[PDB]
Symmetry: D2
Subunit: 284 residues, 4 copies
């Protein structure tokens, strides 16, 4: 299975913060935003990960991640000329995907909790599509899945939502998604829609939908309030429960993709922020 992080977009909902910088390079407490979706792929067992970025923001990502060898992975890059839809991930990313299955994660999404770690490897064998559902108070802000207990309908940002279940930005597909995505026309709102990709899998009878487990947090960081709330959550997990979450150096180390020497290496550079100290303790 190959991994893609959609990390472009104009970030208009964060202006003026994102006039000067990509949403995906914004801090969430103690690490760049892009670290969270990066680690979600890594935890699913994926080592070949492509970022799709705008042309103008790519150098930021290159400066931050290079080719990902320091994290035990192969990170590569592709460019999206304008932000004309999430379903373009599979078109732009088709070379990267090859003949494999794919996991797409959105660059502004944070997944945390039971079932959202190393157990995501269960999706590597995907046949058809697999997507998720997460109860929210305001479903009209998201893609929405309606159940009957199987999935019944999907709608992007419905003015009259048919459930309270948002569809988070993590999607697993077999290789058929490339042809599905290539065949899509632009929606009314001007975009190649991931919700329409999911519709085709649904029509065929091979969309699986799983409600995220009790105790899971899912966050989209695309508003001033949700970005700040995400940071507070991550800090709270460290201060109260002693956990640093989505630390790619740790995940790479726990998966065996880098050794102790390398871990120490990464830690030394990050000593002064406090981030590198966390890394050191993992050893002792």
């Amino acid at each position: 299975m190959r991994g893609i992080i959609l990390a472009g977009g104009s970030g208009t909902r964060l202006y003026p913060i994102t006039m000067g910088i990509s949403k995906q390079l914004l801090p969430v407490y103690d690490k760049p935003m892009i670290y969270y979706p990066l680690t979600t792929l890594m935890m699913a067992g994926i080592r070949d990960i492509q970022l799709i970025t705008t042309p103008h923001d790519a150098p930021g990502f290159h400066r931050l991640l290079g080719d990902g060898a320091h994290l035990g992975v192969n990170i590569s890059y592709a460019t999206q000329d304008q932000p004309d839809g999430l379903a373009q991930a599979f078109v732009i990313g088709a070379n990267h995907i090859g003949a494999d299955s794919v996991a797409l994660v959105l660059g502004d999404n944070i997944f945390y909790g039971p079932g959202l770690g190393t157990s995501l490897k269960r999706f590597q064998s995907i046949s058809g599509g697999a997507i998720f559902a997460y109860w929210v108070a305001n479903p009209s802000a998201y893609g929405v899945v309606e159940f009957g207990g199987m999935a019944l309908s999907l709608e992007e940002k419905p003015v009259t939502p048919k459930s309270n279940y948002a569809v988070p930005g993590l999607y697993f597909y077999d290789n058929d998604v490339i042809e599905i995505a290539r065949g899509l026309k632009k929606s009314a709102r001007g975009e190649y829609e991931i919700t329409e990709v999911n519709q085709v899998y649904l029509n065929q009878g091979r969309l699986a939908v799983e409600v995220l487990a009790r105790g899971t947090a899912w966050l989209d960081t695309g508003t001033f309030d949700s970005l700040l709330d995400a940071a507070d959550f991550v800090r709270t997990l460290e201060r109260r429960q002693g956990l640093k979450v989505s630390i790619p150096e740790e995940v790479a180390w726990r998966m065996g993709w880098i050794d102790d020497e390398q871990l120490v290496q990464r830690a030394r550079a990050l000593v002064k922020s406090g981030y590198g100290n966390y890394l050191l303790e993992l050893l002792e």
Copy 2:
């Protein structure tokens, strides 16, 4: 008076966040970090403002700020190739400063409260230097002033921090030049202040009771800053350091310009506050 914002630095206390974004382009709730020291200069009535940035981050600043004209100011850019210390502000910015007095603000500082708004205009006339003091529990983390003004020491003989806002007459260009490095290895703003102190030409004001001064340079201090700004909006209905507001209140842009900035920033909710300013 001309304005300089130091907005370079390596940001090593924020790694890895600052491996991919400048500290001065960090979000602090509803706006980027640079907006805070920028609006502090604008409130002092300063329209000639040079950002010193690193070569690599400069593009982000440009995309955000351009030439300033939309905020009714003249934003100019200079490069500092290496973060060799704060006093390089004056050497690097000397063509900018010219024959004028100068306000230097640090790119990662927030000033909020009594006496830190449009009353700052009074410093335009500065002769000598003028700096500030602010009580803090952890005086070691900052530069430090003792009163009888008595001693300055960069990182205690008191609990008074010297925050990152400094006003100098034209002499500072020469004084910065006539310096040579500290034990860690930087040209320190603290030494400039020492020089002015030595001639008996440094004024120091304790910031007013109830002022907030913040430095966003660590994971906790940044997040605490963000939280503070949001708290001001949710609890007190105040949006702070909005440059379009300051410019509009100063007469530097007009109603229809304001309405344009607002339309451009409508999706995030930031523009809606600018529209409310008219109603």
Copy 3:
């Protein structure tokens, strides 16, 4: 002008917290809830303050506040046998008020900012009624005032005519007692403060002021609003070095207690940190 704090009620919106203890004895960061409305009355210059409580919660209040002498005021008590509504403050409190004007503050309310400190003494000379207005995003939760000047007043409207809540601070001349005595129970089953205000509005004798820009107003009667309030107060201290609604400070600033008395208060409260602030006042 005399003062009343309504500090009874059942606290159902905080159950099961308030199955133990009164809402008005809950912490907000560094002090009991009741200190905020108490200090409001004090900043208005009022020294004769009656607390109305339930019968069962009274001992908590007596333990905390006693007769108020340590704060340079006279705190007295009355009980409300059932929580039959806010306007009963003026019936229960009739003897306390006597012939005087009165300020009523609700026990779960925090007022902070410009115009909400010692400048409140300007209301002592009230003729008629004077109430306030504060923009909230969710007006249906509160008393609501519509402007055109005040056009209408409605208690928790399903379709609010404005975003302006009517906060729990009210100043009235002596006529309020008879107005309250004449009320019947609303559809809700309570003698409503909103109806008292309606009577003054009917008579053209209700003044309404929108709270100043930069003011905070809070009602702490939900889990979220209680916790939000605590976070706000701690933020003021951590970020701006302010401790707010400290009654010892207010009393000392009014001349009601002296330096040596302030020291005694500080000494009583030193293990928590609260007393250290009081010592820092002296310098």
Copy 4:
């Protein structure tokens, strides 16, 4: 095994808050403080629970908890004349404990996370004593346990000026029946109190103190200062807002244990309608 919650104390470190309310009746977000230690005992499988309070604070606890039957538990109420120390729990509570083992939990403590739920029942068979350890930045502020080279407990000190480790000893203790006589033999410490640390020292010196470092990802909190109380409330709200969990809900535990049935749970939900807390109970039934 019997349970005791120590819920007295003067609460001086929270004055003036605790001049008007017991620390153990303070709000922690959506429930009183006392519900956390109570639910800890219940999750250990303990239904016979003694609450020790001050005499003046007792009525508030009775108003809250009544006879405990709504939670499927039996509540014995005791009072402590003066706050003379933690080990007095076993003297006051001697009749309550009888011949059984006992769990003691401190009224101002919150335990959350792996190993601190229903798996606590593993301590009912305790022989000797069993206590815990939790890394803190400021161990001076707590009882402190030092481990030897072989990883076993080596020393215990209450609030040492020079801590020998960073491991605080949290306020949850499991003991066999010998604890009563041990506690009976104690003299007041240099703080003037009958200390829990001295009880634990007796068992350690006897070679029968077991100490477990709390599992990775656990939260342990003491709510006895303005900042720790507020931090605790923030934590509990974040778990709901972000992870969709309400924690230490004793009605839920009683219902999961089979101590109350569906109709009883609804009855509790109905008493708790206006706050949101009851609505959570209704959601459990689905």
